[PDB]
Design a protein around this ligand. Structure first.
Ligand SMILES: CO[C@@H]1[C@H](O)[C@@H](CO)O[C@H]1n1cnc2c(=O)[nH]c(=O)[nH]c21
Ligand SMILES: CO[C@@H]1[C@H](O)[C@@H](CO)O[C@H]1n1cnc2c(=O)[nH]c(=O)[nH]c21
Ligand code: NA
Ligand SMILES: [Zn+2]
Ligand SMILES: [Zn+2]
Lengths: 157, 157
């Protein structure tokens, strides 16, 4: 299950950067193995710097389920969510987060050094008790290669 | 000019609570004394937990200026922005943030303890660069009074 949905997020990243919607980032929100939302970064398409893949997926899933909490759903991110996106995941009350690549893989291709303290447990004020799983092995390697692969295909933002 | 725009953000908070759009939070984005956006929390109206006042103001200002960065603009928040909102403020490259009430004022009336380390200067992985001003005197009094005046005028989220 984890491998399938992380793969779907990676494919969303590739698709979004291929059609010019935004950067190579994907996010899939799932409710008991039923995909509620499958989105990618829409910053360029929407002219919205908040339209990251995770925030877009949360918005879509919440309007689809007609409620502002997703306590029965889990989110799969192709890359480690940024501070804004992790805050949005916290506010969404999503019960589990699985992400593929570490943020350093995205920083390596010139992206801003923007890492969520609450995700890595390095904060004084912001804490998290959300279940967080960093993928390993297969899906992790594939997700880390995304930034070196999608790199001549978009301009940084 | 700070007091005027902070008071406008507080007025937005009151209006949003009256409308039932969301909670008592407002945000005003300006460009050299010209209001670019004036928003309040729209979580209940939009069925969107990311639709905080600050995120909504950022979206609307970026739509108005036809770009994803607001380096020439400043933001006034009625209350101390949450981690998600401070991350959005960082991504939007706003040059200055002026906030009225400390987050403890919102916590005292039933909101979650959800405080941004980067705003208070305790961040390790996330480090802010923008100028930050906490309101004093009459602006602080107004922004703090917002939560005492709106208690049980809205549904908590
Ligand atoms: C990586 O890095 C980067 C930098 O820092 C900035 C840019 O501007 O942000 C980030 N990003 C982007 N895109 C995205 C999504 O989609 N999601 C999330 O989470 N994040 C993100
Ligand atoms: C304060 O407290 C609270 C809790 O914690 C959570 C909820 O759930 O968040 C927060 N909030 C709300 N609303 C809002 C806006 O509008 N803006 C911002 O910033 N923030 C916010
Ligand atoms: Na408005
Ligand atoms: Zn993000
Ligand atoms: Zn917020």
């Amino acid at each position: 299950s984890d491998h399938k949905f992380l793969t779907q997020a990676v494919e969303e990243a590739y698709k979004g950067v291929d059609c010019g919607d935004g950067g190579p980032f994907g996010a899939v929100i799932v409710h008991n193995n039923e995909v509620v939302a499958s989105c990618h970064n829409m910053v360029l398409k929407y002219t919205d710097p908040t339209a990251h893949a995770e925030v877009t997926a949360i918005r879509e899933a919440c309007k689809k389920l007609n409620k502002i909490e997703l306590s029965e759903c889990e989110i799969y991110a192709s890359c480690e969510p940024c501070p804004m996106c992790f805050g949005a995941i916290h506010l969404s009350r999503l019960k589990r987060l699985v992400y593929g690549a570490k943020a350093e893989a995205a920083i390596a291709i010139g992206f801003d050094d923007f890492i969520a303290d609450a995700l890595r447990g390095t904060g004084v004020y912001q804490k998290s008790s959300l279940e967080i799983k960093k993928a390993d092995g297969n899906g992790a390697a594939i997700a880390e290669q995304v930034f070196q692969n999608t790199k001549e295909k978009f301009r940084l933002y």
